[PDB]
């Protein structure tokens, strides 16, 4: 009573329903400034 | 494996949630334009 443990438990059977699904989500968060770029996607390089 | 179908069921029953029940959707796009309107709604023809 009164003294509640911060974190409780996330529980997954196989059978909920779609909101209390276990989804995976994973975030990707670009930074988009202009300092040397590392990560660049394909595109190919054409010549000058 | 990695060849698949790309159209999968959108399988119903009496029992799921509300959010997996089979809600009926129409839409009704209208144009609003003005070429000669041929739907207008009700609302009397009132004389000249």
Same mark, same amino acid.
């Not at 997954?12 to 968060?29: A, D, E, I, K, M």
């Given at each position: 009573?009164? /003294? +509640?443990? %911060?974190?409780? @438990?996330?529980?997954?059977? #196989? !059978? +909920?329903? $779609?909101?209390?699904? #276990?989804?995976? $989500? $994973?975030?990707? @968060?670009?930074?988009?400034?202009? *300092? %040397? *770029? !590392?990560? /660049?996607? %394909?595109?190919? @390089? !054409?010549?000058?």
């Amino acid at each position: 009573p009164n /003294c +509640y443990f %911060p974190l409780q @438990s996330y529980g997954f059977r #196989p !059978t +909920y329903g $779609v909101g209390h699904q #276990p989804y995976r $989500v $994973v975030v990707l @968060s670009f930074e988009l400034l202009h *300092a %040397p *770029a !590392t990560v /660049c996607g %394909p595109k190919k @390089s !054409t010549n000058l």
